[PDB]
Ligand binder design. Structure first.
Ligand SMILES: Nc1ncnc2c1ncn2[C@@H]1O[C@H](COP(=O)(O)OP(=O)(O)CP(=O)(O)O)[C@@H](O)[C@H]1O
Ligand SMILES: [Mg+2]
Length: 405
């Protein structure tokens, strides 16, 4: 951000500040399981209030509602409540993010007002798919809600979405979390300790498989776990994967990615065994499978097994630096948590002997919180996919859209 406006040089006294934040917090049942991403934005928010901001309007997405209002499932209202105790100040929740009624609530608020808007992805124009003149109008509406713009949404900085790249105000500044996270990665990615291991898991398989190509020019080893592994095993091993996550598009480039890993001397560690489930449910009936046995029809692999855990542990022992994005099983549910807990144990042990260990992702960061290892690894990032795009060597669209100095 050496070429960009940042919040420390933004005059906010008497100004209304509209601020993109990443409040896409994990939720189990109906409540927040991890407030990390909300806590992480507090320094920028308090800064604005302490330095005389008239208001701070906060906007974020939550989940992937795909352009339809889904306030039953994906409302930011609970975040408003959280943000109150974290700040020491009340926050006013609006049930939308645009136009006339929100614009009114934001036009001229009482001094010191903190306002949280509803999920931006309730509108198709944020993403906007899931409409050119409406997109421009959506952007115009958001722009009216402050006099100056701050983007502190590091977690979403890889997304060229309307709230991230489309706000038209004269001053667009990166916030302190954006700065912290970018500075940490610039130092850690400048001359990584080697072997440099990427650990890839999670459930955003379509997105994550498309990052592998360029990551293979940066790392010396890769674990491909969690939900992503099934696409590779089906293609490479002709493994039966039952109802496990599968990415039909990524499947078409699996053999090319393996060839490039071979060409670049990147050792790829795929799981070899699984905990299976008869349905996607915490209380599913469970089984065991190997790559050779395959997974029976109608069942899904929701964790790796012990033999995979040993292979992952071997890769970790070799590593001098690690970036881990995506749990290696459905760790929120105890029947499917063992693989991720075991890998966590190994990643903590590596740290203790000098490995540089970087954990990224809203959900993988929740692993740290669950097993109390947030201060037992080198860095827990608010970015997941965002951090991996930095590892690929890209400029993030949400940073690119900021004002130049
Ligand atoms: N085999 C599997 N099948 C289905 N889901 C799985 C899975 N293994 C892991 N998951 C799910 O992956 C989810 C997290 O994936 P995700 O891609 O969101 O990781 P993350 O949050 O660390 C990266 P990001 O910040 O980009 O969202 C968890 O909810 C976990 O239950
Ligand atoms: Mg996630």
């Amino acid at each position: 951000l050496s070429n960009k406006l940042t919040l420390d040089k933004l005059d906010v006294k008497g100004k209304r500040v509209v601020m993109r934040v990443d409040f896409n917090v994990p939720m189990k049942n109906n409540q927040i399981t991890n407030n990390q991403r909300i806590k992480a934005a507090v320094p920028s928010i308090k800064f604005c209030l302490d330095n005389g901001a008239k208001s701070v309007v906060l906007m974020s997405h939550l989940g992937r509602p795909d352009g339809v209002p889904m306030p039953d499932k994906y409302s930011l209202e609970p975040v408003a409540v959280e943000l109150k105790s974290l700040l020491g100040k009340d926050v006013l929740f609006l049930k939308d993010c645009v136009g006339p009624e929100v614009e009114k609530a934001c036009a001229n608020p009482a001094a010191g007002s903190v306002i949280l808007l509803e999920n931006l992805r309730f509108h198709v124009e944020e993403e906007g798919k899931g409409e050119p003149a409406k997109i421009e109008a959506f952007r115009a509406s958001l722009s009216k809600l402050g006099d100056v713009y701050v983007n502190d949404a590091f977690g979403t900085a890889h997304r060229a979405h309307s709230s991230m790249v489309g706000v038209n105000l004269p001053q667009k500044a990166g916030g302190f979390l954006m700065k912290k996270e970018l500075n940490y990665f610039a130092k850690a990615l400048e001359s990584p300790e080697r072997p440099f291991l990427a650990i890839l898991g999670g459930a955003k398989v379509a997105d994550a498989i498309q990052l592998i190509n360029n990551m293979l020019d940066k790392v010396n080893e890769m674990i491909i776990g969690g939900g992503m592994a099934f696409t590779f095993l089906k293609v490479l091993n002709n493994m039966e994967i039952g109802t496990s996550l599968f990415d039909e598009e990524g499947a078409k480039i699996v053999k090319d990615l393996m060839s490039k890993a071979e060409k670049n001397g990147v050792k790829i560690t795929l799981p070899v065994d699984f905990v299976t489930a008869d349905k996607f449910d915490e209380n599913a009936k469970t089984g065991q499978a190997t790559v050779a046995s395959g997974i029976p029809a109608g069942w899904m692999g929701l964790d790796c097994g012990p033999e995979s855990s040993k292979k992952y542990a071997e890769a970790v022992t070799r590593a001098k630096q690690i970036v881990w994005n995506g749990p290696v099983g459905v760790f929120e549910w105890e029947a499917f948590a063992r693989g991720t807990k075991a890998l966590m144990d190994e990643v903590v042990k590596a740290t203790s002997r000098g490995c540089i260990t970087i954990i990224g992702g809203g959900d993988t960061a929740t692993c740290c919180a669950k097993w109390n290892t947030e201060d037992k690894v080198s860095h827990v990032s608010t970015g997941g996919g965002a951090s991996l795009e930095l590892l690929e060597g890209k400029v993030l669209p949400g940073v690119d859209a900021l004002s130049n100095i």
